[PDB]
């Protein structure tokens, strides 16, 4: 792997991860934002980033963490 010194988060989205705390790991959240990065703080749910159409929930299996929500989540679709 290789590090972008800075990873990321986003506030409306981060706010929502806390919403999936006080609303727990309920069911997947929807932001279209994928700029924010996967963490175990993203455990709080499994979280759905737009990938055109698809707001795909990302697993908060945090051997994927240096990995934004689009890493885990779909993007394109293909054979």
């Amino acid at each position: 792997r290789s590090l972008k010194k800075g990873p990321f988060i986003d506030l409306h989205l981060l706010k929502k991860v806390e919403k999936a705390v006080e609303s727990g790991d309920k069911k997947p959240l929807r932001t279209w934002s994928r700029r924010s990065t996967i963490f175990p703080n993203m455990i709080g749910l499994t979280i759905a980033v737009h990938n055109g159409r698809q707001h795909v929930p990302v697993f908060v299996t945090d051997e994927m963490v240096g990995h934004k929500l689009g890493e885990f989540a779909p993007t394109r679709t293909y054979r």
Binding site: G6, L11, H12, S33
Partner: protein, 96 residues
């Protein structure tokens, strides 16, 4: 091109005095160890659109974000297309 691929770009600036604040080219003079001092590395309840990478280089004449060239304000079409006749204080192509 169209009005729009050009037209898009004018509309982006407004919300900031009705709603927000001001911070324009000063948000990330913090975000390294310039010396990551998180201070404007942490908001997004507020619009997402806009970054200099979301910025592209619209041809002036067409709005063409791409095809674009750093020496004319245009995309290449209009570059060459302007370039050959002159009304310019010099140009040449004479085996070059």
């Amino acid at each position: 091109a169209k009005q729009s691929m050009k037209a898009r770009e004018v509309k982006r600036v407004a919300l900031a005095d009705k709603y927000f604040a001001k911070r324009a080219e000063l948000k990330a003079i913090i975000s390294d160890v310039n010396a990551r001092w998180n201070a404007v590395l942490k908001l997004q309840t507020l619009p997402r659109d806009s970054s200099p990478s979301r910025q592209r280089n619209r041809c002036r004449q067409t709005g063409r974000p791409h095809g674009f060239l750093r020496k004319f304000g245009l995309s290449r079409i209009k570059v060459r297309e302007a370039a050959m006749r002159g009304e310019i204080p010099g140009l040449k192509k004479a085996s070059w």
